[PDB]
Design a protein around this ligand. Structure first.
Ligand code: FDT
Length: 359
């Protein structure tokens, strides 16, 4: 392995990084040789002088969508839901003619026809929620245009769990977190755990995410670098997942539904074929692309996960910035949590280099 050389590669990547982007603290895990390697830097809480630790809770931001995808995926494999089914199958009060051709897959993979990045600030409840989607007008027709959005995968998450009869948070805990024994992963941090909760920093001001409609589904999950490492591992080598529906869930989430250039969308996760040059992934991480509606090319029928992939997901909040990546065929991976939202391509800049030192 070369643990000495390994603590060198990470320190020599992360310290300049943290200095350059003004990051108070970071928790890193590299998985290599079937093992997670934990490395910690700086401060969780600077006014309190609390050091970062492998049980420091960071807000994952958009990386919560990977959890939303496996859940949704587990419900599929359970038979409670199907991607081809019209959305209206699970929410018949969605009465617009607009909603006609949109299947569940569309919501799941951002291709309804233009659902917006975030959910409006006025949407504060289900009524307001329904008026929103009732009176939302497309732009493009179903299955024609990828536009990353919370209002899209958020609604999939919320609809996906209805047949379970469980609220979203209990379903997530029951069908996904506990089975994988992610016992320090929360949608809501218990009072008894807040001391492990890092502070975020935005403009030299400590901040923490605020509640919003559909948050848990699209950005509101919080972890430590240990549960996150085990999460990457369960998805990386799903072969030792007991529960047959969860392993299949992981599988549907890393299936390719849509080809968008060098990238292929899954449920929450995104993929590229390996090998992939650094800058194609790095520039692909730029918001110039990331948040831009691009056309799409159906993978029909959806291909099951290909080990030969760089699968990853970026995600942030006000004061937090994280990123995770893996290469199933290489059995190598990395987690980078930080309490400062710093440039996304900086993130993949670092993770790529660290990973290539292991090849
Ligand atoms: C997910 O990463 C996430 C990061 N901020 C963004 C974005 O598009 O990158 C808006 S969507 C999502 C988020 C974070 N918050 C607080 N709300 N949505």
């Amino acid at each position: 392995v070369s643990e000495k050389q390994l603590a060198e590669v990470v320190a020599n990547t992360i310290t300049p990084l943290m200095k350059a982007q003004s990051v108070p603290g970071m928790a890193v895990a590299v998985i290599y040789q079937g093992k997670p390697h934990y490395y910690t830097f700086g401060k969780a809480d600077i006014a309190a002088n609390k050091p970062v630790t492998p049980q420091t809770l960071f807000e994952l931001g958009s990386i919560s969508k990977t959890f939303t995808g496996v859940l949704g995926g587990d419900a599929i494999a359970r038979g409670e839901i199907s991607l081809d089914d019209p959305v209206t199958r699970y929410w018949p009060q969605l009465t617009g003619k607009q909603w006609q051709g949109i299947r569940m897959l569309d919501l799941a993979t951002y291709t309804a026809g233009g659902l917006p990045l975030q959910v409006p600030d006025e949407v504060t409840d289900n009524a307001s929620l329904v008026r929103f989607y009732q009176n939302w007008q497309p732009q493009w027709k179903p299955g024609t245009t990828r536009l990353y959005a919370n209002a899209s995968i958020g609604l999939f998450g919320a609809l996906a769990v209805k047949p379970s009869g469980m609220p979203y948070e209990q379903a997530m805990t029951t069908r996904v977190l506990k089975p994988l024994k992610l016992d320090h992963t929360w949608i809501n941090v218990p009072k008894a755990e807040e001391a492990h909760y890092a502070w975020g920093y935005r403009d030299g001001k400590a901040v923490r995410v605020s509640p919003g409609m559909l948050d848990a589904q699209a950005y509101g999950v919080k972890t430590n670098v240990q549960d996150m490492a085990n999460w990457v591992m369960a998805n990386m080598a799903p072969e030792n997942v007991a529960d047959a529906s969860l392993k299949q869930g992981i599988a549907l989430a890393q299936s390719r539904y849509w080809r968008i250039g060098s990238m292929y969308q899954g449920l929450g996760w995104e993929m590229l074929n390996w090998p992939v040059e650094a800058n194609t992934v790095v520039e692909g991480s730029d918001s110039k692309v990331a948040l831009a509606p691009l056309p799409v090319v159906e993978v029909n029928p959806p291909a099951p996960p290909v080990k030969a992939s760089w699968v990853h997901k970026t995600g942030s909040t006000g004061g937090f910035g994280s990123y995770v990546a893996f290469i199933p065929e290489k059995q190598i991976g990395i987690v980078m949590l930080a309490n400062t939202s710093y440039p996304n391509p900086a993130r993949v800049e670092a993770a790529y280099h660290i990973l290539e030192a292991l090849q």
